[PDB]
């Protein structure tokens, strides 16, 4: 017995593209995520103005999105399809999450268009067990318990158990 409320599923899947420039670069990099998921993305903006980069305070820069459910497994298969299933040791966080960023969005299966270009983006997977929306509901918050929290090795033998993804030392 493994107490069926001890599985390992996906809570959420994150995505962002940071370009560091407003105008047309941002609003054209907002059509890759829309084709990619099916929903509208959310612009982020600056925090404090830096004289060297070329950003101003509260100037719009990046674009990010959040994915749920059975939609994340599909995009994550096009991911580990791209990375040919050879992640490494230090991609895994100490709390139980990983992430990685692809170099070009041609690998996601999207056809090139010459008024766009290529924008590099990022993936970040967030794991889960039943009871995790305890630490966010308004009424009776409570916390987890720390017999029920995920380590680094359990996640690595979930990735290796599921997608047969090898992990190399390095």
């Amino acid at each position: 017995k493994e107490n069926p409320m001890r599985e390992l599923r996906i809570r959420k899947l994150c995505l962002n593209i940071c370009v560091g420039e407003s105008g047309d670069r941002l609003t054209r990099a907002a059509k890759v995520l829309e084709q990619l998921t099916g929903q509208t993305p959310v612009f982020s903006k600056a925090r404090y103005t830096v004289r060297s980069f070329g950003i101003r305070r509260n100037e719009k820069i990046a674009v990010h999105c959040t994915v749920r459910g059975a939609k994340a497994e599909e995009i994550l298969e096009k991911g580990l399809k791209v990375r040919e299933y050879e992640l490494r040791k230090n991609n895994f966080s100490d709390t139980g999450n990983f992430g990685f960023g692809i170099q070009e969005h041609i690998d996601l299966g999207i056809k090139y268009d010459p008024s766009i270009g290529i924008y590099g983006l990022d993936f970040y997977v967030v794991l889960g067990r039943p009871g995790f929306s305890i630490a966010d509901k308004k009424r009776r918050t409570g916390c987890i318990g720390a017999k029920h929290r995920i380590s680094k090795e359990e996640a690595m033998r979930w990735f290796q158990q599921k997608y047969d993804g090898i992990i190399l030392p390095g």
């Binding site: 308004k138 009424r139 009776r140 918050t141």
Partner: protein, 293 residues
């Protein structure tokens, strides 16, 4: 290599909060407005009307406040319904209005104001702010106290509100968050509210679940069909709530058979045993130490 932030000098300068905020059941900033009486009133109590939502149950209580903790006068649970003949879908809007009615005429059957101050008998949906009667003993009022549930537009709490009001209680309200409010043009219908009261939105599943598929009609209607309830039995009970079974409002709390008084919780390990454990562990570690090496 980073500094531990839960030091001795973190626990020394750490004032704890209140117990009901640590157990997060309450709000003291929302209570302080609701509960105090103005000082020129001199021990005139301030009635509030608690409504609690639980994932299988509804609770409707009435209480003023004292320094010894706020004190109940009249409680109304939502699992005393299957006395009367509503057994399934115990927590919908319908039973939220049926409980507030059972509370209402319970209190009127504990004060002696039954025949006077009837309230609404029919079920229409419009404003029935109950006015007082001259010469007779005056009306009864009680202010609402919802709590930690966002009172948006369409909550089950207000069904209990409309039930205690139409029962006869005089509660201040305004028809802006009731099922039937148009957020673009600001008018209000009654029949949409009475379509939401008796159980017609609950009923419509006798189509969207009874036709399109038949496998999910047994995946999520497994207690209507067990108790043999069709989707046309959306029926009146309120003459049974009205008539005479508030002469047992309390159900006559049942007598108590004498219990064995047996215990199910292992008691506290004493001092002269915690002073004995570490003598066992020091002698076991020295007799499993010097023997080995």
């Amino acid at each position: 290599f980073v500094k531990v932030v839960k030091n001795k000098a973190y626990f020394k300068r750490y004032q704890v909060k209140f117990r009901r905020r640590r157990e997060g059941k309450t709000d003291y900033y929302a209570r302080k407005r609701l509960v105090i009486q103005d000082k020129n009133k001199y021990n005139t109590p301030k009635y509030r009307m608690i409504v609690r939502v639980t994932n299988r149950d509804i609770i409707c209580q009435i209480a003023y406040a004292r320094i010894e903790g706020d004190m109940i006068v009249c409680a109304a649970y939502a699992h005393e319904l299957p006395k009367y003949g509503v057994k399934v879908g115990l927590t919908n809007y319908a039973a939220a209005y049926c409980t507030g009615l059972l509370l209402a005429r319970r209190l009127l059957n504990r004060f002696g104001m039954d025949k006077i101050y009837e309230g609404q008998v029919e079920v229409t949906g419009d404003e029935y702010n109950v006015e007082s009667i001259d010469g007779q003993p005056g009306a009864f009022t009680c202010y609402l106290d919802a709590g930690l549930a966002r009172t948006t537009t369409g909550n089950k709490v207000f069904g209990a509100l409309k039930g205690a009001v139409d029962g006869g209680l005089s509660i201040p309200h305004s028809t802006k968050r009731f099922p039937g409010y148009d957020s673009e043009s600001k008018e209000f219908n009654a029949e949409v509210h009475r379509k939401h009261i008796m159980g017609q939105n609950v009923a419509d599943y006798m189509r969207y679940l009874m036709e399109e598929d038949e496998d999910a009609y047994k995946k999520q209607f497994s207690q209507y069909i067990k108790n043999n309830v069709t989707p046309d039995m959306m029926e009146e009970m309120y003459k049974k709530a009205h008539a005479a079974i508030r002469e047992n409002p309390v159900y006559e709390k049942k007598p108590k058979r004498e219990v064995k008084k047996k215990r199910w919780n292992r008691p506290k390990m004493s001092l002269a045993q915690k002073k004995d454990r570490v003598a066992q562990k020091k002698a076991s570690f020295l007799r499993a130490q010097e023997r080995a090496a």
